[PDB]
Amino acid sequence: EXXXXX
Amino acid sequence: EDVYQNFEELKNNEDPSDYGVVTKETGSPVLVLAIHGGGIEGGTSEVARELSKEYSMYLFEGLKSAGNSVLHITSTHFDEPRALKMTGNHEYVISLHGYAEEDQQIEVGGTDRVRAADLVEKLQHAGFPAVLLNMDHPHAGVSPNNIANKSKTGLSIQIEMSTGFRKSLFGIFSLKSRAVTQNERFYEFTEVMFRFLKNSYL
Numbered sequence A: 001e002x003x004x005x006x
Numbered sequence B: 001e002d003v004y005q006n007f008e009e010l011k012n013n014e015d016p017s018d019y020g021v022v023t024k025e026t027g028s029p030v031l032v033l034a035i036h037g038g039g040i041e042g043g044t045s046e047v048a049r050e051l052s053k054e055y056s057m058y059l060f061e062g063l064k065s066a067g068n069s070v071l072h073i074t075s076t077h078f079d080e081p082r083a084l085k086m087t088g089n090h091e092y093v094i095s096l097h098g099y100a101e102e103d104q105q106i107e108v109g110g111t112d113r114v115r116a117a118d119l120v121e122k123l124q125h126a127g128f129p130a131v132l133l134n135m136d137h138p139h140a141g142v143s144p145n146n147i148a149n150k151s152k153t154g155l156s157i158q159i160e161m162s163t164g165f166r167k168s169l170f171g172i173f174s175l176k177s178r179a180v181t182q183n184e185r186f187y188e189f190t191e192v193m194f195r196f197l198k199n200s201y202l
């Protein structure tokens, strides 16, 4: 370099 | 499900060289927040650091060569002490995230409904693929437990960028080389952000 937050 | 339930648990289980907390405090009312930086949601570090040229910044970075997904703590559980201090010290928060998706998309949420809508309009007019999430959408960023809302006002904008959109901004999409391979699109996007933040938060 692992992409998901309410 | 996250691997860790809070920062204390992460800190107790991970070598400190594998993650890094970085802050820039300038007294600006707005705080730029990237709690899933580094290799967790790649490119959110670079966007945050560019915006830090004008705004206060909190960054949590996963620094592993691989497996940074284990360092993701969702916003409503994210309680690293320097983040709690910084968010509480500022009036407003813009919080940067990434989600998995190959199409280029920007999903905008948060508790600051009129500013979130304005941002989406400005992004759309500037040719960027932004949509506004409303309050019942999943990951709308409205929980009082969300770190981005623990500010002096509670007003936040939550910017979720797809993998495809973030990959469009860098020549090499890696921890090592994103920062030095930022392309014209990267600066076009961050300039729209600079224009919005200056106009929106007077």
Ligand SMILES: [Zn+2]
Pocket (backbone or CB within 6 Å): A004, A005, B035, B036, B041, B096, B097, B098
């Ligand atoms: Zn995130």
